Design a protein around this ligand. Structure first.
Ligand code: HDD
Ligand code: HDD
Ligand SMILES: [Ca+2]
Ligand SMILES: [Ca+2]
Ligand SMILES: [Ca+2]
Ligand SMILES: [Ca+2]
Ligand SMILES: [Ca+2]
Ligand SMILES: [Ca+2]
Lengths: 678, 678
C-alpha cells in the first residue's frame, strides 16, 4: 500500500517545522511584551501559510460525498468473457476505495437533499487502477457529454444570488427538463425514493453506459455494470429528508462510518448484463443511449464478485477529498463504446484533476497511486515526487536499450481497443434518430412502481413544480410529463391549479420491469445497523429498567439502540433536546414515560412537546412505532396513533414486543399511512 | 452598475467561442452518426475545459456567505479625529460592497447553523479601498493570531471522517474551549441568540480590534468600530433554526436579496468608541486584548455615518465569491494596534488570496479594483491584465523622471504609521499578563442578558455539551464554565448527569452592560419585510376572500404575505406541501379554513397534519399567531393554544386583527412560552 509508507504518527514527540526543526506555535514573536509582531517570526508564517492554503477547489459535480476502503473478491475465472486480470480467478481479491456522493450541492450541503447519487469504485488491480464511476440511478439526464454544463448550470443555484442550494426545486432546472426531453427518465428516478435513499448502503451502483468486455482472442460483448446491494433498497420520505437535512447534514456519511466501525461493512454483488454486439439495437432502443436501461427480462444479471467496504479512511482530506476517479482508468479486457456521453467523460475527468490538484502529478497522491510498477516517460511538472533514473525518456531509443517497451494485444499485457470496432460515415454533429424516444422508458419505470411509490413520485413533482415561478415553464413541464403519462400530468397539474394537456398516447404503454421499485423490493434482508429510539424518563425507575430490558433484546439482534431521557445518566445515550425522529428507523415508548406525552408537559431541558413530536413524526413518516409495558392504551391516545394500525405495536411483554417490532423494522415503511389520489 | 464597465450581455446574438468565432455547443463531432467523438472537436473541448475548471477553493473560513452593493454616507467632517478622506465631509458618499457569512461551514452549509458571523465591508474610497473585516460578535475566541489554525481545526469537522458540518457540537471544539480559557467570552456570545441571528439585517458588525484614528497632525486616538443595525436585533430559537437549516439552507441570503429587491435595503449606523492612547489599560483590561469589549458605560458610541445596502450582484461568483477582503486594505487616517490577533491577520489575508485566485493579480478582478488610479512598479505575474507604459519600473530612476513619486505623511497624501507609536523590550514569544482574565467579561455578558435569554444560553450549552462523547472533556468544560458562573455550571451539568465543581468566586461579579441583550433591546423599530403566513383553503371561497382582505391590509404596511392553501390558484402563493412555520414571522388562520385543523384531516396533496403543525410550530417558537374572522375555538383548541395568551390574536374585524397582530410582529418573540430552570 502506497498509503502505509505515507502514514504520519504524531502520538509522541516535540513540535517541528515541515523541515524537522523543533519549534513552538502558541505565541507570536513580538518587539516587547505588548509590541508588534516581527516579520522574522518564521514559526508564525509557516503555520499560517499552511492554514491559508489548506483548501482546494471542490469537485465541479459530486462535491458532497464520503469514502471507504475495502476489497473486491472474484467469484470465478471470467477468462471466458473478459481478459480483465482482476476477474481471472476464483477468490482473487483486489483492494478498492469507494466514494459515494450527491451531484448538485457544494461541500457542506446536506446528504439528504433530493438528487442523483454517485457510486465511484476504484479497483487497485494487478494490471492497473480500474475505476467504475457510477451513480445510484442507471440512466442519465442527457445523451451527449457536450450538454453536461447546460444540465449542471440549470440544476445548480441561480447564478445571480446562488439560490437554491442542493435542489432541482427552481425555475432553471425545470426549464431545462421541459426543453430537453431526454431528461425525463432520470427525472422520474430522481423524483422516486431513489432521489432520497435511506443510506449509501441501501442503494445500488450502476455504470449507466454500455461498455465492452474484450477477451484475449479479441472478441467482445456489450455489458452493463450493476452493483446490487446486499443490505436491500430503502428510501426516506421527503418530509423526513427535509428535517434530516437540518438535524444531521452528515447522516449518510455517519451511517457509512458507523456501519464500518461496528463490523457491518456494506456489501454489493458486482454484476453485469452481457449481450452480443449484434443486439445493439435488438431491444427496441440503442445500447449507445445512456437514457435507456436493458430490462432484466431481456438480459439477466451475472454475479461476478463481492464488493465489501470494511475500513474508514485515516485522513478524510488526503484520501476522500483527494481521490481522483476517471473512466479513462481502464484495464486490458474492458473497452469503451460510442455512447456520446461516455465519449466526452473520458476528456473531462483527466482535465478536471488539473483544477483540483493545481498541477499534473495528481496520480502520485497516495490514494491515486497504483499497486504495480510505473514505467513511462512522463516527466517533471509541479509537485514531481519521483526521481527518474532513466535519462533517455524517449521512444524510440537505443541509449536506454529500448525501454520502456510498448505494450499491446501481443506484448506486455497491453490495453487494446476491441479490434472488431469500426466507424463509417460523414463527420457529423448530428444526433442518431435511434435516440429519439425520450418517453417510453420513463413510462416503463413509472408503471413498475407500487401505487404508494407512484403517489410519492407525483408528490415530489407537485412539491418542486409548485416552487417554479414561471407559469410558462410550468405549462412546458406538464406538456412533457403528459407524453410519459396523462395521469401524472393531471395529478401534478392539480397541485399547481393548471389544466393538463389532453392525452397524447404516442409513447403510452402498460409494460413493467423487475428490480426498479423500492417499496416492491420486499422486506429488508437484514435489520443489523437499523436505529431504534427508546423514549424513557428519569422520573420513573420503572422507565429506565424497561429501556434496559428492550436494549438487551434489540442489541442482541444488531440494532443500534438509543435510550432518550430528559438528562444523561448511566444507560441513557441522548437527551430529548438533541433527539429527533429522523434519528431512528423505529421508536418505542416505555409506558413508564407516559406523563412526558401529555399536552400540558413542559421542561426547561427540552422544547415543548418534544417527546410526543418524536413519536408522532416517526408514525407519520411510516416507521414501526409502539408502546412497551401494559398501559400501552394512553400515549397511543395522546399521539392519535391507532392501536390496531399495521406497524403499531402494543405489548406488556418485552420478548413479544421485540419479536413483533423487528418484523416492522424489516418491512421498514408502513405505506398504508399515506393518502392516494382518487 | 458600479461594475458596469465589466458586464457582458447575452440577451441577443449567436453563440461564439471565447475568441468570437460563431459555433454550436449541443452535439459532439463524431466519425459517423453512431461513431466515436473526435479530438478535433474544439467546440466540445473549450466548453468542457471551462466547465471542468469553474471551481475555486472556498475561503479557509467564512466559506458560506452572501454579499450586496451599497453606499456609505458621512454624517460630518471628521477631520478633527481622522485624516480618512471618506469621512472628511458631511454627506460625502463612498460606494461599498459587504459580504456576510458564517465561519465554520463549507460552501452549501446552512445559513442557520449556530456560529459566529462575518460582516465584511469594503469602502471604495477616493484614497483607496478600505476594508473593515468584522463579525456580528465583538470579541474573538483567541488572543494571538498564531492560534487561529488550532481554533479552526478544533471547530471544523473531525478530520478522519469530516463530521460534523457547520457545528461546534463535537468533542474537539469543546476540548479546545475548555483547554484555552480565552475562548469563554466569544463562546458565551455564540451560545446566545447572537449565534442564530434572524437575518444579516438584524445583527450588528464589529471590528473587534482596537484600531487608531490618525489626524493629519500625526496625533492618534484608539477606536472600536460598531455597525449598529437600523432594523433592530433579532434571533431565531434553536429548535426553529435546526428545521430552517433543512427547509431553507439559503434563508439569510434569500432574506437579504429580497429586502434589496423590495426597496427595503438594510441600514447600519457606522459608529466608533473613541478613547485616548492613555486609556489603553484604564478600563480594568488591555485594549490590545481582542477578547474584551469597552463597556458603553465607559465610552459612548459616536455615529460617523450611514451604511445602506441597496443593490444585489449581477453574477454571484464574479462579485460575491471572488471579493477578497484584507485588513491590509487601510487608508491614510487609520492605523493598526499591537493586538497580536490583528497583527497576524495582516499577513493571512494577503497570502490566502494566492490560494483562492491561483495567482498574484487578484486586485485586478473587477470586485477588487479600486475607483482611483493605480501608480506602482508591480509587474507581470499570472493573469496580468494591465499593459504598463512605464518601461523603467524601479525607484530611484531618472529615465521615468522619478515617477511614481513616494507618498508619505508630508507628500502625496501617503499612508503613514501613527508617529507616536513605539516599541521597547526584549524580542519575546510571551503573553502579556494584562491578557490573563478570561472569565470576568463572559460573566459581564451573561449578567446583561434577560432571564429567558440566560435560559436559551444554558440550553444551547446543554444541547452541545450533551453530544460530547468524552467524560474528561465534559468535566473540563464544567471547570471553565464554573469560573464564569457557578449557576451556569450547575444548570449545564444537570443535562449531562455530571456534578458541577464547587463554586470558585475569583471572577464572579454582578456588573451589567447595555446593548448586548437581544431579548432586552425592545420591540423592532420597523416590521417592514417581516413574513406573514395566511393559512387558507380552496374548499371555501369565503376562506380565500378572508385571505385576500388580510393580504391587502398587511401588504399596505410593507409585510411580505404568503397565502397558503392545498393547491395554487389566483391569490395563493404556496401549497401546504412546501409551507413551514420557519418561513414566517407570524401565522394567521382564516376561520373559513378551520376544517383543515381537525385531527381527522387528510389529503394526498400535503403531509398528514401539515396545516395544524405550521400553527403549532409557530406558537411553540414564540411567534405571533391567531385566527381572523370570529370563530377561533376549533383552531386554537386543536393547537392547544389559549385564546388569552400574549401574542395570540382572535378578532372578527380584519382591521382590529391586523392592528393587534402588527404589535406582536414588533414584539417579535413571546418569551413567556419557554420554561425556566427554578
Ligand atoms: C462531460 C462531463 C461529464 C459527464 C457527461 C459526466 N460527468 Fe461525472 N464528473 C465529471 C464530468 C462529467 C467531472 C467534472 O469530470 C467530475 C468532477 C470531479 C471529477 O473527478 O470528475 C465528475 C464527477 C463524478 C463523480 C464523482 C466521483 C468522486 O466521487 O470523486 C461520479 C460518481 C460521477 N461523476 C458519475 C457520472 C455518471 C454515472 C455519469 C453519466 C453516466 C457522469 N458522471 C457524466
Ligand atoms: C491569522 C488568521 C486569522 C485570524 C486571527 C482571523 N482571521 Fe478572518 N480570515 C482569515 C484569517 C484570520 C483568512 C484565512 O485570511 C480569511 C479566509 C478568506 C479570506 O479572504 O481571509 C478570513 C476571512 C474572514 C472573513 C470573511 C471575509 C469575506 O466575507 O470574504 C471575515 C468576516 C473574517 N475573517 C473576520 C475575522 C474577524 C472579525 C477576526 C478577529 C477579530 C478574524 N477574522 C481573525
Ligand atoms: Ca432558477
Ligand atoms: Ca419510496
Ligand atoms: Ca495554480
Ligand atoms: Ca489498440
Ligand atoms: Ca470531534
Ligand atoms: Ca435569543
Amino acid at each position: 500500500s502506497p498509503l502505509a509508507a505515507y502514514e504520519v504518527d504524531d502520538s509522541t514527540g516535540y513540535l517541528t517545522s515541515d523541515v524537522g526543526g523543533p519549534i513552538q506555535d502558541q505565541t507570536s514573536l513580538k518587539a516587547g511584551i505588548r509590541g508588534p509582531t516581527l516579520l522574522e517570526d518564521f514559526m508564525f508564517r509557516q503555520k499560517i501559510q499552511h492554514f491559508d492554503h489548506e483548501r482546494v477547489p471542490e469537485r465541479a459535480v459530486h462535491a458532497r460525498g464520503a469514502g471507504a476502503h475495502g476489497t473486491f473478491t472474484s467469484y470465478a475465472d471470467w477468462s471466458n468473457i473478459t481478459a480483465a486480470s482482476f476477474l481471472n480467478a476464483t477468490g482473487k481479491q483486489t483492494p478498492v476505495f469507494v466514494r459515494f456522493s450527491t451531484v448538485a450541492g457544494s461541500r457542506g450541503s446536506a446528504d439528504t437533499a433530493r438528487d442523483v447519487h454517485g457510486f465511484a469504485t476504484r479497483f487497485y488491480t494487478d494490471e492497473g487502477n480500474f475505476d467504475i464511476v457510477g451513480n445510484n440511478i442507471p440512466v442519465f439526464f442527457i445523451q451527449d457529454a457536450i450538454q453536461f454544463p447546460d444540465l449542471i448550470h440549470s440544476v445548480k443555484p441561480r447564478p445571480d444570488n446562488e439560490i437554491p442550494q442542493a435542489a432541482t426545486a427552481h425555475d432553471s432546472a425545470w426549464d431545462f427538463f421541459s426543453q430537453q426531453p431526454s431528461t425525463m427518465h432520470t427525472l422520474f428516478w430522481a423524483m422516486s425514493g431513489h432521489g432520497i435513499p435511506r443510506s449509501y448502503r441501501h442503494m445500488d451502483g450502476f455504470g449507466c453506459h454500455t461498455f465492452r468486455f474484450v477477451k484475449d482472442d479479441g472478441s467482445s460483448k456489450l455489458i452493463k455494470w450493476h452493483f446490487k446491494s446486499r443490505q436491500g433498497k430503502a428510501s426516506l420520505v421527503w418530509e423526513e429528508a427535509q428535517v434530516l437535512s437540518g438535524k444531521n447534514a452528515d447522516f449518510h456519511r455517519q451511517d457509512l462510518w458507523d456501519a464500518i466501525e461496528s463490523g457491518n461493512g456494506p456489501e454489493w454483488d458486482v454484476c453485469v448484463q452481457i449481450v452480443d454486439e449484434s443486439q445493439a439495437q435488438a431491444f427496441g432502443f440503442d445500447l449507445l443511449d445512456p437514457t435507456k436501461i436493458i430490462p432484466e427480462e431481456y438480459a439477466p444479471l451475472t454475479k461476478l464478485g463481492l464488493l465489501k467496504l470494511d475500513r474508514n479512511p485515516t485522513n478524510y482530506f488526503a484520501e476522500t477529498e483527494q481521490v481522483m476517479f476517471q473512466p479513462g482508468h481502464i484495464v486490458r479486457g474492458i473497452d469503451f463504446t460510442e455512447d456520446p456521453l461516455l465519449q466526452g467523460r473520458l476528456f473531462s475527468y483527466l482535465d478536471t484533476q488539473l483544477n483540483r490538484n493545481g498541477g499534473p502529478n495528481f496520480e502520485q497522491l497516495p490514494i491515486n497511486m497504483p499497486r504495480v510498477p510505473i514505467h513511462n516517460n512522463n516527466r517533471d511538472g509541479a509537485g514531481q515526487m519521483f526521481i527518474h533514473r532513466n535519462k533517455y525518456p524517449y521512444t524510440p531509443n537505443t541509449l536506454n536499450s529500448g525501454y520502456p517497451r510498448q505494450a499491446n494485444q501481443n506484448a506486455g499485457r497491453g490495453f487494446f481497443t476491441a479490434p472488431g470496432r469500426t466507424a463509417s460515415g460523414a463527420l457529423v454533429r448530428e444526433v442518431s434518430p435511434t435516440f429519439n424516444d425520450h418517453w417510453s422508458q420513463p413510462r416503463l419505470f413509472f408503471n413498475s412502481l407500487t401505487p404508494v411509490e407512484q403517489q410519492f413520485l407525483v408528490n415530489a413533482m407537485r412539491f418542486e413544480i409548485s416552487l417554479v415561478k414561471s407559469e410558462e415553464v410550468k405549462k412546458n413541464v406538464l406538456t412533457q410529463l403528459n407524453r410519459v403519462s396523462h395521469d401524472v400530468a393531471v395529478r401534478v397539474a392539480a397541485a399547481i391549479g393548471l389544466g393538463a394537456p389532453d392525452a397524447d398516447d404516442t409513447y403510452y404503454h402498460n409494460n413493467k420491469t423487475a428490480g426498479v421499485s423500492i417499496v416492491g423490493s420486499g422486506p429488508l434482508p437484514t435489520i443489523k445497523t437499523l436505529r431504534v429510539g427508546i423514549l424513557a424518563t428519569t422520573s420513573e425507575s420503572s422507565a429506565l429498567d424497561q429501556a434496559a430490558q428492550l436494549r438487551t433484546r434489540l442489541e442482541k439482534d444488531g440494532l443500534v439502540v438509543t435510550v432518550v431521557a430528559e438528562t444523561l445518566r448511566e444507560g441513557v445515550d441522548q437527551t430529548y433536546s438533541t433527539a429527533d425522529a429522523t434519528g431512528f428507523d423505529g421508536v418505542v415508548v416505555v409506558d413508564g414515560a407516559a406523563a412526558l406525552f401529555a399536552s400540558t408537559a413542559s421542561s426547561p431541558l427540552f422544547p415543548t412537546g418534544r417527546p410526543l413530536q418524536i413519536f408522532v413524526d416517526a408514525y407519520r413518516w411510516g416507521k414501526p412505532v409502539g408502546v412497551c409495558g401494559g398501559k400501552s392504551s394512553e400515549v397511543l391516545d395522546a399521539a392519535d396513533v391507532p392501536e390496531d394500525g399495521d406497524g403499531v405495536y402494543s405489548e406488556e411483554s418485552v420478548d413479544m414486543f421485540v419479536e413483533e417490532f423487528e418484523k416492522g423494522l424489516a418491512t421498514f415503511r408502513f405505506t398504508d399511512r399515506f393518502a392516494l389520489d382518487s
